[PDB]
Amino acid sequence: MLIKVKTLTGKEIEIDIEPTDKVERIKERVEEKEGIPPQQQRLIYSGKQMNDEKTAADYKILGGSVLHLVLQLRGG
Amino acid sequence: KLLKEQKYDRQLRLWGDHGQEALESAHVCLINATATGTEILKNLVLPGIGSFTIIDGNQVSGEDAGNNFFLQRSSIGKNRAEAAMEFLQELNSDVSGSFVEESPENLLDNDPSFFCRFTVVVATQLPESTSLRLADVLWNSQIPLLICRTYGLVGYMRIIIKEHPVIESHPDNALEDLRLDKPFPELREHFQSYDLDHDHSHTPWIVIIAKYLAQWYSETNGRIPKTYKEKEDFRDLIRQGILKDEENFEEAIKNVNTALNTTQIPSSIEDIFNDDRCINITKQTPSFWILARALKEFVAKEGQGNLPVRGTIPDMIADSGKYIKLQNVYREKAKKDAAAVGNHVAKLLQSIGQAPESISEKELKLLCSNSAFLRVVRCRSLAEEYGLDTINKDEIISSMDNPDNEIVLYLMLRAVDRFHKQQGRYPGVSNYQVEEDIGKLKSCLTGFLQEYGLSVMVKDDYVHEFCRYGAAEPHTIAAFLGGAAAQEVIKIITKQFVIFNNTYIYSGMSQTSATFQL
Amino acid sequence: LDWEGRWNHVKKFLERSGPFTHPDFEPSTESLQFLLDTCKVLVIGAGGLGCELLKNLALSGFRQIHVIDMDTIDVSNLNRQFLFRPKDIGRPKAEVAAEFLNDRVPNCNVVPHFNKIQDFNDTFYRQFHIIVCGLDSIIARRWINGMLISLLNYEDGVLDPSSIVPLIDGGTEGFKGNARVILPGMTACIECTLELYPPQVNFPMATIASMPRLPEHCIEYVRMLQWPKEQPFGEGVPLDGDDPEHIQWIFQKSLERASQYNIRGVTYRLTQGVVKRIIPAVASTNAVIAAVCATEVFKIATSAYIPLNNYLVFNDVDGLYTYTFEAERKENCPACSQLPQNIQFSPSAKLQEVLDYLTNSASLQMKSPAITATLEGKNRTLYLQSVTSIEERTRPNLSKTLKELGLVDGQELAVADVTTPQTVLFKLHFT
Ligand SMILES: [Zn+2]
């Protein structure tokens, strides 16, 4: 299965993940191509904030699916 | 003096002393003291923009005064420019303000080169004709231009710089330049000076994967783990070494998903390298390209297919002597790698005929450490965007496969402008007009779509909405635009971040925005 | 009165209807007057987001506005908080902010509140139709969030809609920032997303006290260990992060406690940063987010368009990017849920093991909680860290198991942390 995970700047990168892989790795792959430490990686898919313990399947991720990287800020 | 440093501290942590200089030396030109223009200027005057100048022929009207935070009731009747300038002036006494009580058209007509004195020109709430004219005049003078227009809840932003190249692109994240896959002399001698058996958790996580990867390179005839299955195995190979529970040992185990492949000239740098502005140098070649060439030449000779070494490494749980001495291994290649790139520049400037030291060392060092992050943005002139033969139909049509893609808002703006060109007035300004014009606007849209042959379905929903707007400038929308716009001007001025490419559309009604390449 | 044309830009969305209007909207020539006269809005924070927010609301049609802020004007605000002049330094932000607006914008009527948000209670917050946020810490957001949730009353399961005070909060940090719209009890609350925040970077004592690599560790030492043991400026006296003298000293000491380990990167600029954990800030990013928040408040009060659903992130480092999504409301949130959170613990549980499921559980951190159950109508105050006294007169309890403290199955508990005003519940479960 091939998925796209839109970055925090709009840059869309595609990645290979067969269903069973945990979200926790979808992050490993992203870190691999972009250098974004997985700790600060917050993945969002259809409003659901992908729990790094569940699995791509647990979120109905299907080929043409896109995951967005988000960030919540402290200062104001 | 060191009083300023106290005031601008939260931003110097963003673009530094040098960014603050470019800014304090710049001179910005604002075309209209409307709420949108006033908001933008506000965001430049606060950080310290050297000086600004406001061109505005209009007089301050009732509504002008109702949505401007820099115009008052008393301002009504007075020249919008001069009036706005008086309150903006109060925001920062270190900024010098000026105003010209003339019109853009009026100026573009008499003194056509008045605008050559400016670093960047920001024009706001401008009618189509005026834009096209100014866009043209400024494009042929090599002057950056930012066109911003507020209409209803729609935000329009058009930047126009022929070429804007940058070294400090300030990337959020980026793989490290560790060099494990292609270790250099000094580095290897280091890795060997150690011993994996004779500190169990005080050795840099790097010296770890190094000596455990130097091992695997002999148990399979020097092959690097490439298949995931292979990497997984290399993991457990390091697992079998934690003589016991170690943090760094269990740390190096995650660094494997990166520390292996970090060396690779990026696409972006490649295109710069292969760009003609790089291959063909002359005495007109701006320093940006001469350094991009020196890097090119470098990669060929001393570089060995790779960019100079960055010179920096991340934090790795380890000893306070092993870490620092490991750091100089890089801090040193970097300096020497840069000195080489510095040679290619020397020679290079000579085959051209320019003084050997026409490019400082500060530049060079900044260049080398950022080599992997160069970015070159070129914006299609406006005249091309508006051309019948040159329009970017594909971009338009593609986006239209989504009836709610921001691009409709752009198309609608062109319709509203065609409409203004026709009626000498915008669609639905008075309340009784909203009715009748809903039709006249629809005909204008459909007429604009033909002149360009754009076979797309624009919902009739959007044709209503734009009449409801009555060409209003809702401060909060203006304020958003003012925000986004000023930072791009800051970028052009500092040459420190990456400017959006062509057009940025904002829908304050759905709170979403998009960037296109018209 | 007001002059001819003063609100034309705002009138077109109240005087005229349209396709994107909200189902409750109704064109009225009288709605503007109503909004200027009866709409109570409470901005929370008067530093940047707050400053920009007041102006936006002010020019949008809101007149009845209150501001809250416990801070004082500092020179380092002057590069983004345009309501304060250098002559205003030392004065309280809420006051100077209110003063500027009541002057710049004709009949606005902002009411300052030189207070911490915890000073007030629910009596106070019901006064308002909307709460805009521009806070500077997470705890503050979690608190005001709990507050608004504890204002909701459910008439037998069904939630009374008019007990919902819409909450709009913005965030900022460098060129990145995010706006947001909460409908306490319907949409996701601050807690329903608590895990979207960045990790916390804490330098382990081992590397600061002995293994200093970065130039920050050298500073973190001088400030966290060396200042106490050699109370430079008199005993007892703590270091004032805003004292050019105090900092100067930490700096000077950081230079030395750096050479002893050969490290460069020790600057005054960095010293202030580590010491205060400074966040880079600029006018532009604040202006953006606040323009967004401002606009939403406007929609919620007028129904001129539909309220943004949930989230909005914004980054300005590479072009201009903005993702807008809809945060899932965890139907199990310790905050906005309807009933107690069924916690699972086998009867053997110790006790200090509950003070750690709350304290360290990502789902809902707790800065320093206190549990209290019911044993004989008599409410046992099991543990606590609020009052130093009770702390000791309770500390031992962190050893006796549940039933070993009269804890049956099915009955709930009660936790209260400095993070929220409301009493969070938990129906304990043995299995
Ligand atoms: Zn909740």
* H helices, E strands: number in chain A: 1, 4
Helix (H, G, I), strand (E, B) or coil at B211: helix
What does C374-420 look like in DSSP terms, one character per residue?
Answer: ESSSSEE----SSSHHHHHTTGGGSSS-SGGGT--SS----B--TT-
Alpha-carbon distance of B377 to B278, in angstroms, equals 15
Helix (H, G, I), strand (E, B) or coil at B42: helix
CA C205 to chain CA centroid, Å, is 29
Quick count: other Cβ atoms within 10 Å of Cβ B494?
20
Angle at the Cα of C303 from the Cα atoms of C300 and C308, rounded to 5 degrees = 55
In DSSP terms, which residues pair with B121 in a beta bridge?
Answer: B29, B145
Cβ within 8 Å of residue C349, ≥6 positions away: C401, C402
Asked if B461 and B89 count as a contact pair (C-beta separation under 8 A), the reply is no
Domain boundaries, chain C: 1-199+279-329, 202-278, 330-390
Q: Does C367 touch chain B (CB under 8 A)?
A: no
Asked if B506 and B481 count as a contact pair (C-beta separation under 8 A), the reply is yes
The approach used to solve this structure was: X-ray
CA-based max dimension of chain C:
76
Helix (H, G, I), strand (E, B) or coil at B473: coil
Q: How many CB pairs under 8 A join B and C?
A: 230
How many Å lie between the alpha carbon of A73 and the closest alpha carbon of chain C?
5
CA distances from B169 to B165, B287, C219 (A): 9, 17, 29
What is the DSSP code (8-state) at residue A50?
A: -
Q: What's the gap in Å between C188 CA and the centre of ligand 1?
A: 6
Helix (H, G, I), strand (E, B) or coil at A48: strand
Residue C21 falls in which region: left (phi positive, over 0), alpha (psi -120 to 50) or beta = beta
Q: Which of B2, B203, B476, B500 to mutate to test the interface with C (most CBs of C within 10 A)?
A: B476
Range list of H helices, B241-358? 247-259, 267-274, 276-279, 287-300, 322-352
Instruction: Name the residue among A5, C16, C254 with its Cα closest to residue B428.
Output: C16
Could you say which architecture CATH assigns to the domain A1-76? Roll (3.10)
Alpha-carbon distance of C149 to B28, in angstroms, equals 48
* Tokens standing for residue B50: 């050297």
In DSSP terms, which residues pair with C168 in a beta bridge?
Answer: C132, C181
Q: Which of A11, A67, A72 to mutate to test the interface with C (most CBs of C within 10 A)?
A: A72
Q: What's the gap in Å between C330 CA and the centre of ligand 1?
A: 6
What does C297-350 look like in DSSP terms, one character per residue?
Answer: HHHHHH-SSPPPPSEEEEB-SBS-B---------TT-TTT-SS---EE--TT--
Asked if B85 and B107 count as a contact pair (C-beta separation under 8 A), the reply is no
In angstroms and rounded to an integer, the radius of gyration of the C-alpha atoms of chain C is 25
CA distances from B160 to A46, B43, B384, B406 (A): 36, 20, 11, 20
After what residues is chain A interrupted, C–N > 2.5 A? none
Say which of A9, A31, A34 has its CB closest to residue B257.
Answer: A31
Asked if B149 and B122 count as a contact pair (C-beta separation under 8 A), the reply is no
CA distances from B107 to B57, B111, B113, B134 (A): 10, 5, 9, 10
Alpha-carbon distance of B136 to B142, in angstroms, equals 10
After what residues is chain B interrupted, C–N > 2.5 A? 198, 244
CATH domain C330-390 topology: Ubiquitin-like (UB roll) (3.10.20)
Same topology for domains C202-278 and C330-390, yes or no? no
Nearest CA in chain A to B171: A9
Helix (H, G, I), strand (E, B) or coil at C172: strand
In DSSP terms, which residues pair with B514 in a beta bridge?
Answer: B505
Asked if C77 and C70 count as a contact pair (C-beta separation under 8 A), the reply is no
Instruction: Name the residue among B154, B150, B124 with its Cα closest to residue B507.
Output: B154
Yes or no, beta carbons of C325 and A75 under 8 Å apart: no
Could you say which architecture CATH assigns to the domain C202-278? Orthogonal Bundle (1.10)
**HSE-up of residue C372 (Cα within 13 Å, Cβ side):** 17
Instruction: Name the residue among C412, C406, C400 with its Cα closest to residue C371.
Output: C412
CA distances from C65 to C43, C68, C101, C108, C131 (A): 7, 10, 11, 8, 10
In DSSP terms, which residues pair with B99 in a beta bridge?
Answer: B54
Asked if B380 and B502 count as a contact pair (C-beta separation under 8 A), the reply is yes
Could you say which architecture CATH assigns to the domain C1-199+279-329? 3-Layer(aba) Sandwich (3.40)
Yes or no, beta carbons of B479 and C312 under 8 Å apart: no
In angstroms and rounded to an integer, the radius of gyration of the C-alpha atoms of chain B is 28
* Tokens standing for residue B407: 């691009």
Helix (H, G, I), strand (E, B) or coil at B343: helix
Question: Exposed, middle or buried by CB within 10 Å (0-12, 13-18, 19+), for B74?
Answer: exposed
* Tokens standing for residue C225: 């260990």
Element (H, E) at B450: helix B434-451
Element (H, E) at B210: helix B205-216
Range list of H helices, C181-227? 205-209, 215-221
Asked if C13 and C61 count as a contact pair (C-beta separation under 8 A), the reply is no
Q: Which of B10, B169, B172, B175 to mutate to test the interface with A (most CBs of A within 10 A)?
A: B172
Cβ within 8 Å of residue C404, ≥6 positions away: none
Element (H, E) at C96: helix C93-104
Helix (H, G, I), strand (E, B) or coil at C360: helix
Cβ within 8 Å of residue C163, ≥6 positions away: C151, C152, C153, C185
Alpha-carbon distance of C431 to C424, in angstroms, equals 22
**HSE-up of residue B368 (Cα within 13 Å, Cβ side):** 29
Angle at the Cα of B297 from the Cα atoms of B292 and B300, rounded to 5 degrees = 130
How many angstroms separate the first and last alpha carbons of chain C? 70
Q: What's the gap in Å between C337 CA and the centre of ligand 1?
A: 6
Quick count: other Cβ atoms within 10 Å of Cβ B44?
30
What is the DSSP code (8-state) at residue B124?
A: E
* Tokens standing for residue B159: 């930047």
* Torsion from C-alpha of B481, C100, C140, C390, nearest 10 degrees: 170
Quick count: other Cβ atoms within 10 Å of Cβ C203?
16
Alpha-carbon distance of C17 to C29, in angstroms, equals 11
Q: What's the gap in Å between C193 CA and the centre of ligand 1?
A: 8
Asked if C400 and C313 count as a contact pair (C-beta separation under 8 A), the reply is no
Alpha-carbon distance of B78 to B113, in angstroms, equals 27
Alpha-carbon distance of B322 to B327, in angstroms, equals 9
Say which of B172, B258, B515 has its CB closest to residue A31.
Answer: B258
Residues of A in contact with B258 (CB under 8 A): 31-32, 35
CA distances from B224 to B182, B194, B208, B256 (A): 11, 22, 16, 11
Asked if A21 and A67 count as a contact pair (C-beta separation under 8 A), the reply is no
B293-306 burial, b if ≥16 CB within 10 A, otherwise e?
bbbbbbbeebbeeb
Say which of B63, B69, B324 has its CB closest to residue C213.
Answer: B324
Element (H, E) at B446: helix B434-451
Alpha-carbon distance of B447 to B458, in angstroms, equals 13
C273-294 burial, b if ≥16 CB within 10 A, otherwise e?
bbbeebbbbbbbbbbbbbbbbb
Question: Exposed, middle or buried by CB within 10 Å (0-12, 13-18, 19+), for B91?
Answer: buried
Helix axes of C244-259 and C268-276: crossing angle, nearest 10 degrees: 110
Q: Does A9 touch chain C (CB under 8 A)?
A: yes
Q: What's the gap in Å between B7 CA and the centre of ligand 1?
A: 39
B160-190 burial, b if ≥16 CB within 10 A, otherwise e?
bbeebbbbbbbbbeebbbbbbeebbeebeeb
Yes or no, beta carbons of B175 and A9 under 8 Å apart: no
Alpha-carbon distance of B168 to B173, in angstroms, equals 13
Instruction: Name the residue among B235, B147, B156 with its Cα closest to residue B469.
Output: B156
Alpha-carbon distance of B374 to B341, in angstroms, equals 15
Instruction: Name the residue among C27, C287, C335, C54 with its Cα closest to residue C179.
Output: C287
In DSSP terms, which residues pair with B124 in a beta bridge?
Answer: B148
Yes or no, beta carbons of B258 and A9 under 8 Å apart: no
Q: Does B89 touch chain C (CB under 8 A)?
A: no
Alpha-carbon distance of B459 to B437, in angstroms, equals 16
Strands B27-30 and B51-55: parallel
Helix (H, G, I), strand (E, B) or coil at A62: coil
Quick count: other Cβ atoms within 10 Å of Cβ B471?
19
How many Å lie between the alpha carbon of A66 and the closest alpha carbon of chain B?
17
- Nominal resolution in Å? 2.9
The residues in A 53-72 lying below 8 A from C, measured between CB atoms, are 68, 70-72
* Tokens standing for residue C24: 């409750």
Residues of A in contact with C48 (CB under 8 A): 76
Instruction: Name the residue among B109, B69, B517, B166 with its Cα closest to residue B363.
Output: B166
How many Å lie between the alpha carbon of B93 and the closest alpha carbon of chain C?
10
Domain boundaries, chain A: 1-76
Alpha-carbon distance of B54 to B38, in angstroms, equals 10
Amino acid at C391: E
Alpha-carbon distance of A68 to A44, in angstroms, equals 5
How many Å lie between the alpha carbon of B170 and the closest alpha carbon of chain A?
12
Backbone angles phi, psi at C196, to 5 degrees: -90, -10
CA distances from C56 to B193, B311, C51, C59, C65 (A): 64, 46, 9, 5, 12
Cβ within 8 Å of residue B339, ≥6 positions away: none
Cβ within 8 Å of residue C226, ≥6 positions away: C253, C257
Instruction: Name the residue among B505, B513, B504, B503 with its Cα closest to residue B379.
Output: B503
Helix (H, G, I), strand (E, B) or coil at B271: helix
Neighbours of chain C (3+ CB pairs under 8 A): A, B
In DSSP terms, which residues pair with B161 in a beta bridge?
Answer: none
CA distances from C191 to A32, A52, C209 (A): 31, 18, 36
Range list of H helices, B54-111? 62-66, 80-89, 104-109
Asked if C266 and C255 count as a contact pair (C-beta separation under 8 A), the reply is yes
* Tokens standing for residue C42: 């409470």
Backbone angles phi, psi at C111, to 5 degrees: -120, 110
What does C218-263 look like in DSSP terms, one character per residue?
Answer: HHHHIIIIITGGG-SSSSSPPP-TT-HHHHHHHHHHHHHHHHTT--
CA C28 to chain CA centroid, Å, is 36
Backbone angles phi, psi at B55, to 5 degrees: -100, 125
* Tokens standing for residue C294: 């401002």
Element (H, E) at C176: strand C176-182
Element (H, E) at C154: strand C154-155
Alpha-carbon distance of B180 to A63, in angstroms, equals 34
CA-based max dimension of chain B:
90
* Tokens standing for residue B47: 């950080």
Cβ within 8 Å of residue B90, ≥6 positions away: C85
Alpha-carbon distance of B347 to B25, in angstroms, equals 32
Yes or no, beta carbons of B46 and C308 under 8 Å apart: no
Helix (H, G, I), strand (E, B) or coil at B147: strand
* Tokens standing for residue C28: 């009225």
Yes or no, beta carbons of C5 and B61 under 8 Å apart: yes
In angstroms and rounded to an integer, the radius of gyration of the C-alpha atoms of chain A is 12
- At which residue do the structure tokens 């204008």 appear? B444
* Torsion from C-alpha of B488, B492, B495, B501, nearest 10 degrees: 60
CA distances from C429 to B54, C239, C412, C423 (A): 70, 47, 9, 19
Domains in chain B, ordered, with CATH? 1-173+372-518 (3.40.50.720), 174-371 (no CATH)
Asked if B84 and B61 count as a contact pair (C-beta separation under 8 A), the reply is no
Say which of B10, B324, B472 has its CB closest to residue C8.
Answer: B472
What does C46-85 look like in DSSP terms, one character per residue?
Answer: -SSHHHHHHHHHHHHT---EEEE---B--GGGTTT-TT--
Instruction: Name the residue among C418, C421, C386 with its Cα closest to residue C121.
Output: C421
* H helices, E strands: number in chain B: 22, 10
Strands A42-44 and C154-155: unpaired
Alpha-carbon distance of B316 to B254, in angstroms, equals 12
Yes or no, beta carbons of B172 and A9 under 8 Å apart: yes
